[PDB]
Amino acid sequence: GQKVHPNGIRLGIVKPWNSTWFANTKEFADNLDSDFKVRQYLTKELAKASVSRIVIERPAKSIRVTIHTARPGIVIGKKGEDVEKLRKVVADIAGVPAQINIAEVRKPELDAKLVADSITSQLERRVMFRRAMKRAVQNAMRLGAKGIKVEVSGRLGGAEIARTEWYREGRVPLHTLRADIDYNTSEAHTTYGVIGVKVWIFKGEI
RNA sequence: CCCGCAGAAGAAGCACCGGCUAACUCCGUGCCAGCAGCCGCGGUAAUACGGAGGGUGCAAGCGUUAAUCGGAAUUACUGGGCGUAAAGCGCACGCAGGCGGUUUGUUAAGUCAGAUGUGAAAUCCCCGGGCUCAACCUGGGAACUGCAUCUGAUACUGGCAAGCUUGAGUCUCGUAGAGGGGGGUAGAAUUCCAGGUGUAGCGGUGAAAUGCGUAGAGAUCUGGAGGAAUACCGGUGGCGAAGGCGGCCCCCUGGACGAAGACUGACGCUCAGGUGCGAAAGCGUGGGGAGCAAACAGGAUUAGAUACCCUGGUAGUCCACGCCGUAAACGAUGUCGACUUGGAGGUUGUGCCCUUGAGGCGUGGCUUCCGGAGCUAACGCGUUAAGUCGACCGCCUGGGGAGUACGGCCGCAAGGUUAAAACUCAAAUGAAUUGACGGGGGCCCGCACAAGCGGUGGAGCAUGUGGUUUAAUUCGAUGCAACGCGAAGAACCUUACCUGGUCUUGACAUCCACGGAAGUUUUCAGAGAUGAGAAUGUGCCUUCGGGAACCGUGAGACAGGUGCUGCAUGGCUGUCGUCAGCUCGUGUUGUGAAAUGUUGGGUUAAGUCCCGCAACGAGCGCAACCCUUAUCCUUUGUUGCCAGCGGUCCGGCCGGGAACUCAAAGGAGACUGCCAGUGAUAAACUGGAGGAAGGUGGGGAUGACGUCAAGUCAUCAUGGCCCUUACGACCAGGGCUACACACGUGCUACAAUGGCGCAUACAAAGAGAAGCGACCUCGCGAGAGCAAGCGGACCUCAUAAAGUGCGUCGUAGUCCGGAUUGGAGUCUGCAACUCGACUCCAUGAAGUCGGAAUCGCUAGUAAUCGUGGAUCAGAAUGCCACGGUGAAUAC
RNA sequence: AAACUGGUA
RNA sequence: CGCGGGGUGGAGCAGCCUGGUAGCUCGUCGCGCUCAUAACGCGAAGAUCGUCGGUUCAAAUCCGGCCCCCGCAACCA
Ligand SMILES: [Mg+2]
Ligand SMILES: [Mg+2]
Ligand SMILES: [Mg+2]
Ligand SMILES: [Mg+2]
Ligand SMILES: [Mg+2]
Ligand SMILES: [Mg+2]
Ligand SMILES: [Mg+2]
Ligand SMILES: [Mg+2]
Ligand SMILES: [Mg+2]
Ligand SMILES: [Mg+2]
Ligand SMILES: [Mg+2]
Ligand SMILES: [Mg+2]
Ligand SMILES: [Mg+2]
Ligand SMILES: [Mg+2]
Ligand SMILES: [Mg+2]
Ligand SMILES: [Mg+2]
Ligand SMILES: [Mg+2]
Ligand SMILES: [Mg+2]
Ligand SMILES: [Mg+2]
Ligand SMILES: [Mg+2]
Ligand SMILES: [Mg+2]
Ligand SMILES: [Mg+2]
Ligand SMILES: [Mg+2]
Ligand SMILES: [Mg+2]
Ligand SMILES: [Mg+2]
Ligand SMILES: [Mg+2]
Ligand SMILES: [Mg+2]
Ligand SMILES: [Mg+2]
Ligand SMILES: [Mg+2]
Ligand SMILES: [Mg+2]
Ligand SMILES: [Mg+2]
Ligand SMILES: [Mg+2]
Ligand SMILES: [Mg+2]
Ligand SMILES: [Mg+2]
Ligand SMILES: [Mg+2]
Ligand SMILES: [Mg+2]
Ligand SMILES: [Mg+2]
Ligand SMILES: [Mg+2]
Ligand SMILES: [Mg+2]
Ligand SMILES: [Mg+2]
Ligand SMILES: [Mg+2]
Ligand SMILES: [Mg+2]
Ligand SMILES: [Mg+2]
Ligand SMILES: [Mg+2]
Ligand SMILES: [Mg+2]
Ligand SMILES: [Mg+2]
Ligand SMILES: [Mg+2]
Ligand SMILES: [Mg+2]
Ligand SMILES: [Mg+2]
Ligand SMILES: [Mg+2]
Ligand SMILES: [Mg+2]
Ligand SMILES: [Mg+2]
Ligand SMILES: [Mg+2]
């Protein structure tokens, strides 16, 4: 969209990076490739756990990953057995010793990545978008959001021509760098094509 | 009709499924075939066409066609309309006809009441009865709404008789008026004729020409002829039935209004047919004809102009007598009568009064505007109704055909009046709302214009595109918003495209079987891919039948597609446009679409802010938070720096120090903040002080709701379709670099503000490990050998050019200008021929400032001068980025 | 001063 | 042998008492203007003076022949 990405324009203001590792030009590209590969693998296996965001850092010659989820039971289960296999496989793919950590994020409905997935999941199960999206809105504000905005684009309802529909409630100042906006997207693969979902959540002014 | 035998045995189809209207999916087709009562579907994803499955409706029937009523209040008696949707005759007078104030009597026609007679049967309806129920048949009743006769009622209508005055009318006294017909006369001005002075133009247009004038125009003065109209007064003035009627005077004559008083006594309203009047144009006869002006002539404009414009000009316009009878003949509103809140004016009468006044209080006629209830689709009308009623008349029944054809009547003619049908469409139309647009208006902004500088379009060259050709010249992108664009690097690869040579579970993922360590070395053929051999090697885990890393062969599921659809899409992007706007809640207004807010008075770069207000609040957007830059302060002080001191090959280089530049972390500061003035006292504006920085200080990032079915299926993903012994995969070469032309964006020049030689100044920002590559040696050179240092304030790329100090050229195709071309070289790379970059020697085209046209820029801007970076083995005049010098003009 | 026009669905 | 004027580029044209670089209207090929077309503007190609002989720096303008067209005469086939 012609609007600059909120999660990219505030990286140096109120949005920490999802990767905090340092490296020279000799291995910067290799580190990027490893990070992308591990993220792509992990997000597929942990689809049920509803991972919000995955942060990766470089301890003293090793790989450390921290995944924030609202359903730590699936990834933890009994003892650390379900995380041991994930640790060993991520270490295998990264080529260096790995350490994975689980973080709990309560009130999942207030998370952008998560709210979207909900929507997309629903749509994929032939649910009326209009209402899928309206609940998302209400849910959130109930929880306390100072604002929320939802948008869905594509062949809504299997129509012959694509259409975009959005709902905005509360206050969502996109030009205020002081404010923090949790922005995220998500896609769906329905029999009629691909439907894009896009959610902004405004939590505070600073 | 009843009984007996046997046996589910002999018995279900038609229409429809997009909305109306009950009932949905797939496949085929691709604006074709076809469907269709109306709206309308079908131009590769059809619930509308064809088939299948499923479903809905009806059923021995179902559907289509034909016809009547209904719906249709769409001929409106019950029960419609005519200001603007169709529809008030141009106006008036009036016969027939319709209707008609009030008091009594009489009649009993209309009217109403009762009775009698009649209104065939069948049929319709109510209660019953019989066919096995029903249809069907049948008993009784009701109805048969009507008609006639007789007997009564007398409120209303009608008739007859007799009255009344409020409707209508006559008489007396006055008033205003472009009311009408005839005659007379006056002033101004235009034209023309005669004469006087005078002399080169006049006249007309946007600008011209035609035209008039030296045979004397135009201008000016004197005299005369003739035609037409009456300048102000003159007005939201007047008169007239309408059309219509303006100088002044006379004669004849119509209507209206006011004062009371008297008189008649319903004598009234309306009006088919009929009669009369009736703008302008037009016609007939006879006059007149100054101006104006159809037709016509010429000159202009134009692509054309038998038009708009200009110069002339006939009919006509004028008069008398006749005819024509039509107009947006409009108030788009028929006449008459009654009732219904007001306000402000004009014109014309009249009554009472302290009458002092150009004054107070009343009562009539006509007339203009605004508005209440009411009405109206709305606009609007509103005591002069389009409000509530009554009497009569005229007219309307979708649009076009058509106010047309035929017939009749009228006219000298032109034509007028009355007035159809066939056929064709699903609309035509009225009021109002939102938006857009206007060769409408107002206000405001932007390098929009203007004022300036420098350019492009001319020449050479670089690059992209179109076109053409080619084996291929891969595919995209196309006004602004494509054309140095995807592409931040086409000699192989890249690379899909062309020609050849090869493969078919494959180059790549995954399941299975068998064999085989991987890998390292060479050889035959061949352009290579490729086949075809010899070698070497035969190791980890190893449950001792094998796995994990990996290689070869084979079968089938598959893998694969830069193949199509950006008009199925996600994601991403361009533009209007960094313009200030775009919206939502409740509230209120309107039948409604919608309006309000959001408009108005100020102000701002801003829907920025203040005041007002039928609105009160909020959201996106603007500003502000962010980065950079300009001043100062705290900390820190090397690889950076050197003020005060010292030893100083007298170099910040070596003791040392940290003041300062500087480097990077944290703070201060600028906020219309302090004052003056202006301004509705508010917002705000102008100026001043202080201050490095005065008015969001300069610059960047930041791009609202939406438009362009804008771009991308090729970055990637993805619905549908297609290929899969080829549209997939491998290799050699070629091509994307062609070239009779055109266009876009740039570089280098046409020189003296310069070129060349010597000397010699002053910068910032970046990269560096298959990398940057000092110094030294060789070479006139691109470069080669040696090769330290440096993963970085250290070393290298890397001595910035413009600039300034001297000398030469002295205005030319030149000591400017460099393309082209020949010879000889340097360097990346398996590979420089198609097709790279750089260097040395030689030749030295075009070009001497560039048409129509067109582009950027308002301050460190433009202008011009250097340096770096990405892409990248080797490549820039392109892209990104840093600094030096440094303007002109904005009324 | 001049200043036309815009295939069909 | 028939009274006059003529013959410039694809077409129509200017140079006459003035024998001095071939120019101007419409056509062809370009460019500009416009969203696009027409209109309009700026440009380029295009030549023995119809064809020959005397005269002459010179060219229908000074002349003399040849060929073609037109006013009429041109009969009329
Ligand atoms: Mg239905
Ligand atoms: Mg189909
Ligand atoms: Mg009816
Ligand atoms: Mg009606
Ligand atoms: Mg009338
Ligand atoms: Mg009458
Ligand atoms: Mg009566
Ligand atoms: Mg009677
Ligand atoms: Mg019975
Ligand atoms: Mg019976
Ligand atoms: Mg009967
Ligand atoms: Mg009576
Ligand atoms: Mg009288
Ligand atoms: Mg009549
Ligand atoms: Mg007349
Ligand atoms: Mg006449
Ligand atoms: Mg006459
Ligand atoms: Mg005229
Ligand atoms: Mg008429
Ligand atoms: Mg009139
Ligand atoms: Mg009128
Ligand atoms: Mg009328
Ligand atoms: Mg009114
Ligand atoms: Mg007629
Ligand atoms: Mg007739
Ligand atoms: Mg500016
Ligand atoms: Mg200018
Ligand atoms: Mg050029
Ligand atoms: Mg394609
Ligand atoms: Mg192309
Ligand atoms: Mg194309
Ligand atoms: Mg290639
Ligand atoms: Mg598109
Ligand atoms: Mg309402
Ligand atoms: Mg608005
Ligand atoms: Mg509004
Ligand atoms: Mg305002
Ligand atoms: Mg605001
Ligand atoms: Mg010293
Ligand atoms: Mg100041
Ligand atoms: Mg901003
Ligand atoms: Mg942007
Ligand atoms: Mg398109
Ligand atoms: Mg396209
Ligand atoms: Mg090849
Ligand atoms: Mg190319
Ligand atoms: Mg030189
Ligand atoms: Mg480099
Ligand atoms: Mg560095
Ligand atoms: Mg040379
Ligand atoms: Mg020169
Ligand atoms: Mg390179
Ligand atoms: Mg036309």
Domains in chain A: ranges and CATH = 16-106 (3.30.300.20), 107-206 (3.30.1140.32)
- Distance CA A111 to C1' B61 in A: 68
Q: How many CB atoms lie within 10 A of CB A107?
A: 13
- Distance CA A31 to C1' B824 in A: 53
Q: What is the distance in A from the centroid of ligand 22 to the CA of A179?
A: 74
Q: Are strands A147-154 and A51-57 parallel, antiparallel or unpaired?
A: unpaired
Strand B, nucleotides < 7 Å from a protein CB: these are: 45, 568-575, 577, 618-626, 701-706, 709, 717-720, 768-769, 791-792
How far is it, in rounded angstroms, from Cα A164 to Cα A200? 16
How far is it, in rounded angstroms, from Cα A159 to Cα A81? 47
Residues of A24-43 as b/e, b for ≥16 C-beta within 10 angstroms?
Answer: eeeeeeebeebbeebbeebe
| Helix-then-strand count for chain A, H and E | 6, 7
Checking each nucleotide's C1' against the CA of A159, the nearest proves to be: B568
Q: Amino acid identity, residue A124? A: E
Q: What is the distance in A from the centroid of ligand 10 to the CA of A60?
A: 118
Method: cryo-EM
Handedness of CA A141, A143, A66, A82 (dihedral sign): negative
How far is it, in rounded angstroms, from Cα A141 to Cα A115? 12
How far is it, in rounded angstroms, from Cα A118 to Cα A186? 10
Residues with CB under 7 A from strand B: A 1-5, 9, 12-13, 24-26, 147, 153-155, 160-162, 164, 166, 168, 170-179, 185, 187, 189, 191-196, 198
Q: In this structure, are residues A108 and A100 in contact, taking their beta carbons and an 8 Å threshold?
A: no
Distance of CA A39 to the CA centre of its chain: 12
Closest CA to A48 of A25, A75, A81: A75
How far is it, in rounded angstroms, from Cα A42 to Cα A81? 16
How far is it, in rounded angstroms, from Cα A97 to Cα A106? 30
